[PDB]
């Protein structure tokens, strides 16, 4: 929790070095992303990309084939909850406009 402080304290001082302004919430999120895992989780192919997200999701960065080899071998199952996983499947991603569903209601329809 003090490591989170030291993280943002530093990240922010790098941005403010140039003079440029970034709204807390952005660095705070990134700092909070690295942090949550339980300790400092490097934004590297051996930190976040080595975490337990999607398979196709993880593969779309750095260990492409190598990730897919362990996929088949340990029989990983894909959520398809991830943005990237849908992009590879040509599915409307569950983001912004696709993060809910639309339905017609015969009740409201016959009312008008």
């Amino acid at each position: 929790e003090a490591g989170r402080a030291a993280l943002y304290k530093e990240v922010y001082n790098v941005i403010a070095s140039d003079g440029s302004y970034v709204n807390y919430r952005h660095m705070a999120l990134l700092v909070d992303v690295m942090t949550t895992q339980g300790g400092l989780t490097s934004v590297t192919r051996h930190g976040f990309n080595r975490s337990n997200t999607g398979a196709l999701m993880r593969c779309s960065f750095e260990e492409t084939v190598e990730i897919l080899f362990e996929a088949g071998a340990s029989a990983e199952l894909d959520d398809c909850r991830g943005v990237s996983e849908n992009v590879i499947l040509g599915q409307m991603a569950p983001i912004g406009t696709g993060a809910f569903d639309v339905m017609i209601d015969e009740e409201s329809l016959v009312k008008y």
Binding site: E1, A5, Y24, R25, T36, G38
Partner: protein, 107 residues
């Protein structure tokens, strides 16, 4: 709690798990000199009883995994004597909200 000056031999250290449901902890006297908790960067960490934890998970529609984590070896976890699965409520100040409450599960 056992306060040791320099070390505890690998011989004696084997006896720590030996007597459950009771629990034993080892704290180096030199680490205890200054209280971490008091520091500028460390916020309020609070233990959650099974009752509170089950409620936190019900309320945020979570799985025990889906919660942010704290190491068992975390200086604060050791201080409060966190056990694996126990939840901490983290109360930091905010330049955005004023106060923010986070939660970390112990692994």
């Amino acid at each position: 709690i056992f306060v040791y000056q320099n070390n505890i031999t690998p011989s004696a250290m084997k006896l720590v798990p030996s007597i459950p449901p009771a629990t034993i902890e080892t704290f180096n006297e030199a680490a205890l000199v200054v209280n971490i908790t008091h520091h500028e960067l460390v916020p309020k960490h609070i233990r959650l009883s099974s009752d509170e934890k089950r409620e936190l998970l019900k309320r945020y529609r979570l799985k025990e995994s889906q919660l942010p984590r704290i190491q068992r070896a975390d200086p604060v976890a050791l201080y409060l004597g966190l056990k694996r699965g126990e939840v901490v409520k983290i109360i930091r100040k905010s330049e955005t909200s004023g106060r923010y409450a986070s939660y970390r599960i112990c692994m």
